[PDB]
Symmetry: C2
Subunit: 66 residues, 2 copies
């Protein structure tokens, strides 16, 4: 994967951004989150993930709570 920290995530809207070292923030949607738990993330949370290119540009995939 790749590593970063959740910059913010709105659990009502179902999206937020992941902050990365030496890079632009990366959009994260709830559908990308891994695990049986409720599909939410919280400010400051450590994650591993993959950057993929969709029709709107870069986005996270395979987002795992560390």
């Amino acid at each position: 994967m790749q590593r970063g920290k959740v910059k913010w995530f709105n659990n009502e809207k179902g999206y937020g951004f992941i902050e990365v070292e030496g890079g632009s923030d990366v959009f994260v949607h709830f559908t990308a989150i891994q695990g049986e738990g409720f599909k939410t993330l919280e400010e400051g949370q450590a994650v591993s993930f993959e950057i993929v290119q969709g029709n709107r540009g870069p986005q996270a995939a395979n987002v795992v709570k560390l």
Copy 2:
């Protein structure tokens, strides 16, 4: 976003392909499958998905079983 059908899926390894009417097959990994329950797909199952590009080439995302 579009629909297709599962071409095949190797349950042990957790990946397979979705076949698209008039288009190329799309690789699908279990981590893209939405919903609760054991992450798996069955040959012939209709699905909705999006296509993203990662380091390995095009792959499915937001795979929903219809």
